[PDB]
């Protein structure tokens, strides 16, 4: 019944602040909830769009400020003094009934960094891979043979560690397919205008 459109991904340094928006349409208190990397949910607080009254989780009361712009049917969440614990997906929720699509916030000291892309060649079926290391921010995209190779692929979720991301992908094909045919991973990182093709060669 109510649709909630949230603003796009945010990237901030430790100690900085973030402001995220939630535009409501259709026809209740606006709640904000954090979803942590392990999927756990934490309620931040709520605001009455009518008069502007608020209620906060004591955990967030010192750093979070909720506001509403009635003229634009838009709710805002401001969160200051950010730490890595605040790297999460933030949802606005109307009446605890309808959820927005979520806004990612990443809190990191990292600067934009292009990935290094490394071929993973083997030491009836053969497994090859592609290691995409040391990039920031998300996302990267990875395909095999320009997308024509889609079966037998496992592309793993990116993981942030020491303030850079790593991703990897494996592809498994019949032994008669490679190296008799070519296998290439195609990696794109738009934030750094990176587009690389890494052909996997026998060692």
């Amino acid at each position: 019944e109510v649709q909630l459109l949230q603003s796009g991904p945010e990237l901030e340094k430790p100690g900085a602040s973030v402001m995220i928006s939630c535009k409501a349409s259709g026809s209740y208190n606006m709640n904000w909830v954090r979803q942590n990397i392990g999927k756990s949910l934490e309620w931040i607080g709520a605001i009455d769009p009518y008069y502007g009254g608020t209620s906060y989780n004591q955990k967030f009361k010192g750093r979070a400020t909720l506001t509403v712009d009635k003229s634009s049917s838009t709710a805002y969440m401001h969160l200051k003094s950010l730490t890595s614990e605040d790297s999460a997906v933030y949802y606005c929720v109307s009446g605890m009934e309808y959820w927005g699509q979520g806004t990612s916030v990443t809190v990191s000291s990292a600067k934009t960094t292009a990935p290094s892309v490394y071929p993973l060649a083997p030491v009836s079926s053969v497994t090859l891979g592609c290691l995409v290391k040391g990039y920031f921010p998300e996302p990267v995209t990875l395909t095999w043979n320009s997308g024509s190779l889609s079966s037998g692929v496992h592309t793993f979720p990116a993981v942030l560690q020491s303030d850079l991301y790593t991703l990897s992908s494996s592809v498994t094909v019949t032994s008669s397919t490679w190296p008799s045919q070519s296998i290439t991973c195609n990696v794109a990182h738009p934030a750094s205008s990176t587009k690389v093709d890494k052909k996997i060669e026998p060692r």
Partner: protein
């Protein structure tokens, strides 16, 4: 604050099975006004949560009647009479009797059952390209296994190395219902040139003994 405890953490089912999931609160959710503010949400893979049941047993608009909620006081249950593919995802309970703060259970993942499957394990030495830049990552894929729990250790010249490991896991495969894992051990080139024997070792339900793949740097 009220602690919501959900069990089990993971519930594997076959399509068509009944499913029951439990949510227990650290104290009674009966409010002084007579209401019990216990609610259930489903978050399907890649989506935002959706409300299924509010105030113990009220089905939210559009929710099919195969979903039902029951319980009282501190003990609550969500039942699915017959599980469908579209029901797979993470179920959360929440309480709003004792606020602030409203609190949530940790989630129960409703997943598909299939036959046990041993992982296909593949190990990869550093690429020549990476070595040129002075780094040395060793990668192990453990692919298409079931059930989901698995443990990996890296052992170098017969001794475990814990520093420099980065692990990632896929969600349940849409085609074969299996799970996969990637483990990357990142060393400096100097460290790599100090030891020659590299082993990726896993434990998994499918074997009483460790599952291993190895290589010798010196070929």
């Amino acid at each position: 604050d009220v602690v919501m405890t959900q069990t089990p953490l993971s519930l594997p089912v076959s399509l068509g099975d009944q499913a029951s999931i439990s949510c227990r609160s650290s104290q009674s959710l009966v409010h002084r006004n007579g209401n019990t503010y216990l609610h259930w949400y489903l978050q399907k893979p890649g989506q935002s949560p959706k409300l299924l049941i509010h105030k113990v047993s009220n089905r939210f608009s559009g929710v099919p009647d195969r979903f039902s909620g029951s319980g009282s006081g501190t003990d609550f249950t969500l039942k699915i009479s017959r599980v469908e593919a579209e029901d797979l995802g993470v179920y959360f309970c929440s309480q709003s009797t004792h606020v602030p703060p409203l609190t949530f259970g940790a989630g129960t993942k409703l997943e598909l059952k299939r036959a046990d499957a041993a992982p296909t394990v593949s190990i990869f030495p550093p690429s020549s390209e990476q070595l040129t830049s002075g780094g040395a990552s060793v990668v192990c894929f453990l692919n298409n296994f079931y059930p989901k729990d698995i443990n990996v250790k890296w052992k170098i010249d017969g001794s475990e190395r814990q520093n420099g490991v980065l692990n990632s896991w896929t969600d349940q495969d849409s085609k074969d219902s299996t799970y996969s894992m990637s483990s990357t051990l990142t060393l400096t080139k100097d460290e790599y040139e100090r030891h020659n024997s590299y082993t990726c070792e896993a434990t998994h339900k499918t074997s009483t003994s460790p599952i291993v793949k190895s290589f010798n740097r010196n070929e």
